[PDB]
C-alpha cells in the first residue's frame, strides 16, 4: 500500500520530502527531483569496497532508502522511476551515451539511464544520476534547441537525426588554490557536451550487460576512480579518490567557486558521514585512476 510502513513513505522520508501539495504537476516533479539530488548521492563506493552494484529494484531500494546510500545511474534513476510511477507520473526509461572530451565522441555503449516524464501532453527529461556539476536542478522540457537556464548552468537539449543531445553552458571557474589549478578533475570548456540519447522506451533488463561491464571493465571510469557527489542548495560536494571538492554556483561575477582539500585515509570515513551521510559496512579503498572524469 501507500500508507504507514509503506515503501513510498520510506522513500519520501529518505529524501526529506514532507510536502503534500497533492498534485501530479511540474512543481511536484521538480520538488521530488531536487529533494532526491540533495539527499541521494551519485556514488560508486560499493565497487571500491569489494561489493557489487545491484540492478534489482528490491536491492536498490534497500541500499539507497534503508541503508542511506547513493548509487550510479542504474540505481538512483531506477529508484526515481519507481517513485514517480508509484505516485502516478507517466514515466519512461531512456538509454544514453556519455560524451568523452578526450575522445570527442559519445560512448559506444548505452552506459547511462535517464527518464522521460509526461505531464498534460508536455514532455520532460529527468535525471538524478549523472552527478557533479552536470546535474540538472529542474526537469528539462523536450524542446530542440531551447535555452533552459538553471542555477548550475544553462542546459540545452537538441535533436539531430533521431538523437537527442544534452549540453550545458557553464560559468567561469574560480579556483582560489593555485595548487589545484590543473587538477585532472577540472576541464576548461564553458560549452560542454554531456550525453546523447534516443526516445526509445527501455526496461531495466536493457541494462543487464552494461551493469556488469561498468563495474568490471578497466575501461570504465567506475572501476578507475572512487567517487561520490551530492547537490546542495547552492552548489555541489564531490569526493574523487582522496580529493574533496565543493563548488559554489555563481559565487561572484558570473563565476563558480571551486574549493579543494586533499584528505588522508583517516578523514575519508568522517567526510563520507558528515558531508554525504554515507556509512559503509566494508572498508573503502579510495582510488584515483586515470580514466577521464571531471566535476
Ligand atoms: Cl535551477
Curated annotation (Swiss-Prot):
It is found in: Cytoplasm. It catalyses: an arylamine + acetyl-CoA = an N-acetylarylamine + CoA. The keyword Acetylation applies. Pfam families: Acetyltransf_2. GO terms for molecular function: arylamine N-acetyltransferase activity. InterPro entries: Arylamine_N-AcTrfase, Arylamine_NAT_domain_sf, Papain-like_cys_pep_sf. Changing residue 154 to I: In allele NAT1*11; catalyzes the N-acetylation of aromatic amines and the O- and N,O-acetylation of their N-hydroxylated metabolites at rates up to 2-fold higher. GO terms for biological process: xenobiotic metabolic process. GO terms for cellular component: cytosol. Keywords: Acetylation, Acyltransferase, Cytoplasm, Transferase. CoA binds at residues 108-109, 213, 219. Belongs to the arylamine N-acetyltransferase family. This is Arylamine N-acetyltransferase 1. It comes from Homo sapiens.
Amino acid at each position: 500500500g501507500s500508507g504507514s510502513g509503506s515503501d513510498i513513505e520510506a522513500y519520501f522520508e529518505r529524501i526529506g520530502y514532507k510536502k503534500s501539495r497533492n498534485k501530479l504537476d511540474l512543481e511536484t516533479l521538480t520538488d521530488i527531483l531536487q529533494h532526491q539530488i540533495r539527499a541521494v548521492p551519485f556514488e560508486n563506493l560499493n565497487i571500491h569496497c569489494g561489493d557489487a552494484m545491484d540492478l534489482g529494484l528490491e536491492a536498490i531500494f534497500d541500499q539507497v532508502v534503508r541503508r542511506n546510500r547513493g548509487g550510479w545511474x542504474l540505481q538512483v534513476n531506477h529508484l526515481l522511476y519507481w517513485a514517480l510511477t508509484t505516485i502516478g507520473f507517466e514515466t519512461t526509461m531512456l538509454g544514453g551515451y556519455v560524451y568523452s572530451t578526450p575522445a570527442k565522441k559519445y560512448s559506444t555503449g548505452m552506459i547511462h539511464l535517464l527518464l522521460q516524464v509526461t505531464i498534460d501532453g508536455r514532455n520532460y527529461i529527468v535525471d538524478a544520476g549523472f552527478g557533479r556539476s552536470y546535474q540538472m536542478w529542474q526537469p528539462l522540457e523536450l524542446i530542440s534547441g531551447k535555452d533552459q537556464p538553471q542555477v548550475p548552468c544553462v542546459f540545452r537539449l537538441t535533436e539531430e537525426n533521431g538523437f537527442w543531445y544534452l549540453d550545458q553552458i557553464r560559468r567561469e571557474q574560480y579556483i582560489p588554490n593555485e595548487e589545484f589549478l590543473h587538477s585532472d578533475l577540472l576541464e576548461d570548456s564553458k560549452y560542454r557536451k554531456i550525453y546523447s540519447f534516443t526516445l526509445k522506451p527501455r526496461t531495466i533488463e536493457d541494462f543487464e550487460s552494461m551493469n556488469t561491464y561498468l563495474q568490471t571493465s578497466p575501461s570504465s571510469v567506475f572501476t578507475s576512480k572512487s567517487f561520490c557527489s551530492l547537490q546542495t542548495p547552492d552548489g555541489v560536494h564531490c569526493l574523487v579518490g582522496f580529493t574533496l571538492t565543493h563548488r559554489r554556483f555563481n559565487y561572484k561575477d558570473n563565476t563558480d567557486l571551486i574549493e579543494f582539500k586533499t584528505l588522508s585515509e583517516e578523514e575519508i570515513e568522517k567526510v563520507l558521514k558528515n558531508i554525504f551521510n554515507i556509512s559503509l559496512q566494508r572498508k573503502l579503498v579510495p582510488k584515483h585512476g586515470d580514466r577521464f572524469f571531471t566535476i
